[PDB]
Structure formats: structure tokens, C-alpha cells
Design an enzyme around this catalytic site. Sequence first.
Site, PDB file in Angstrom:
ATOM      1  N   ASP A 186       0.721  -1.607   0.308  1.00  0.00           N
ATOM      2  CA  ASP A 186      -0.230  -0.383  -0.295  1.00  0.00           C
ATOM      3  C   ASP A 186       1.240   1.432  -0.280  1.00  0.00           C
ATOM      4  O   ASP A 186       1.173   1.331   0.947  1.00  0.00           O
ATOM      5  CB  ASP A 186      -1.181   0.277   0.996  1.00  0.00           C
TER       6      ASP A 186
ATOM      7  N   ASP B 151      -1.130   5.665  -5.631  1.00  0.00           N
ATOM      8  CA  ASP B 151      -1.868   4.420  -4.612  1.00  0.00           C
ATOM      9  C   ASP B 151      -1.697   3.127  -4.538  1.00  0.00           C
ATOM     10  O   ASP B 151      -3.262   2.725  -5.985  1.00  0.00           O
ATOM     11  CB  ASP B 151      -2.953   5.437  -3.699  1.00  0.00           C
TER      12      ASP B 151
END
EC number: 3.4.23.46
Length: 358
Positions: free
Chosen positions: A34, A217
Amino acid sequence: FVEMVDNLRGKSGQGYYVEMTVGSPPQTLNILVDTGSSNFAVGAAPHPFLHRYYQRQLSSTYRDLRKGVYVPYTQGKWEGELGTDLVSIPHGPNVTVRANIAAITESDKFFINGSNWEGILGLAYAEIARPDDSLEPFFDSLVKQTHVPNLFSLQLCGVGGSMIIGGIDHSLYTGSLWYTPIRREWYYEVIIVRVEINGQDLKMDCKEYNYDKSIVDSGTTNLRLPKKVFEAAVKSIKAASSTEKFPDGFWLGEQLVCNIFPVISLYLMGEVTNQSFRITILPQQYLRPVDCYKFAISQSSTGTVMGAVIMEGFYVVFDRARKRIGFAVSACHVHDEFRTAAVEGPFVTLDMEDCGYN
Ligand SMILES: C[C@@]1(c2ccc(F)cc2F)C[C@@H](c2cncnc2)SC(N)=N1
């Protein structure tokens, strides 16, 4: 880096995960990669959704920080107890580091029922670490304690992929890498300077593209756009694809649908004054299989989010050492015989600093 190729797995819409070990003796866990958060947080209790969890009682190298952390998100949350332990990545660099670990002790809407991961690796910067920036993110610890270069790269294939830690594997991309500056080290914040749908400029004040930020992201599936930008982009995509008509709910992602679709181009701020480059994705990236498909472009109140919809087209280099992010055409991206994802430059773009929101 041969050993790091193909070290990512996942299921569609459930994120990409890497195998890690925590503790002595080592406990194997699957961990979501992440770039949109900065905590290393792992399930530490027998939640029914989890295949495995961190058992601190079995680790001789575990150290308690005697601090808790509560992390709410828009929908869902996790809560944990902070500590440190020894951490390795089996299909990564041949090193072990002492890292901060949040032992997750309760959560809601965080773990996914049916997924094969049980923790998250937050690869972004300390400024957004919870509870505060004194909690050193994992990658910061890795670079501090080893000789691993301060860079990582991601090839996300539409699932499998590669996380190359401390380097770049030139077999994972075609053409040249093109770099955009990291505006600020919190999220991997970037600046979008122009948007085209099928080569047609959206004609908006470029500040709107980055209101209130634009980020890269890997922990988000969709390309998320500021609502004003989304409205305009949907208008243009609707117009370009008017051979067939679709319900208004489909464009809002409220329902599924089962060459008509345009390419989407994002021009990013280049390395040099008045210089930009563009990345271009296909419907193969933004119409995601659920043949039923979800429209994977959506509105945001948190700015542009270049999620998996963007990253699956490209090999993405998080060059932390030089505060820049590189994009190149991914050797694995999904395309057809008529169109491919592209990274092209240089272009002349003036007033690019005016595009950033303050
Ligand atoms: C940590 C987070 C995340 C990613 C995947 C996941 F399976 C669970 C998660 F918690 C938060 C997500 C989020 C949700 N709601 C408001 N803001 C962020 S987006 C992201 N990149 N990472």
C-alpha cells in the site's frame, strides 16, 4: 532482482500482497502492498476472516512499545498495540530489520472476507503515519538499517506482479522511464497538469485536477477524480462512447454493464521547467471485470487517486532517493491489437506550478 520478479499475488479488487516474515522464529504472513498509507499493521488476533495472524507470544525478539493506536477510515477502522520486531521479505532483499509493527486487536470493514492477506505494508512517508510522524515507517527502517537503496518499483499485472525492492528491473518495462517530482513527502503526491479524453483536452483550470491533492496509491483499485473533474471526464467519455447508450447509474458505479471507449491521458509535471510527459490508459484498465464490468473511475473528495486502474498500465518507480516517481509502459499490461498504454514526452506545458493546490 530475479528473485523479486513475480513476488506479488492477489485477487481482483482485493489488492496485491507480498509474503513477509515477522518475529523469531519467523512467522509467515501475506501483506497488502500500500503506497497510500504509512503503517505496518498486521492481524494479531483470530478474526474469522484471517488465514493466519501474528502471535507475539511466540517471538523472542518482540518488544512492546506500550502505546495503542486507533485508525478510523471513512468506512471501517483498525485499532492496535504498537511494538517492534524483526521483519524479512523472503522474495526481497537478503536482510532482516527491526521494524515498528501495529498488532491489530480489533477492526471493522478492514480485513476482507475471502482474501488471502492479513496485514498491510504502508510504503508512504512518516508524515501520515498513525498516531504521528515519530512512528518510523517500514521502508524508512529498511533503508536506515541496511545498504538497500532508497527506491522501490511496482509492476502490477491485471492477479500477479512484482515489487522490486532497492532497484529497477528493466525487463518489466518497454521504452523509457519518465519521472514526475514527488511534490511533498507524505503521500506520494504528484501534480497532474493536463487531462485528455481521446486526445481532447478537458480544458479545466489544472488546479482542479489536483484539488486537494493527487496521489499514486497501490492500495486503491479505482482512478478516483475530484468531482468537478469527474463530472467533466464522464461527460467526455459519454460523448466519445455514444455509439452505445448506458444507464446513468453505470457511470456512477451504482450498477454493472454487460473500441467504443476512449483512451484517457494524464499529463504529469516533468523534471524540467515547462516540461511535461503524458501517460495513457485504455478501457481495459478502467472497465474492470466483475461479461460484467464496473466503471472504475469515481468521484473523490480527497483529490485524484491514481489507483490500480492507472498502475496496471505501467511500471512505476518510487525513487525516494531523488524525490520522484518514474512511469514506463508495463511489459505485462492488458491491451488489444489496436491500442496500448503509453508513456510519451517531452511536451511543453507552462504554469505547471499553478496546478498544485495550496
Ligand atoms: C489503509 C488503506 C486500505 C487499503 C486497502 C484495504 F484493504 C484496507 C485499507 F484500510 C485505507 C484506504 C482508505 C479507505 N477510506 C478512506 N481513506 C483511505 S485507501 C489506502 N490506500 N489504504
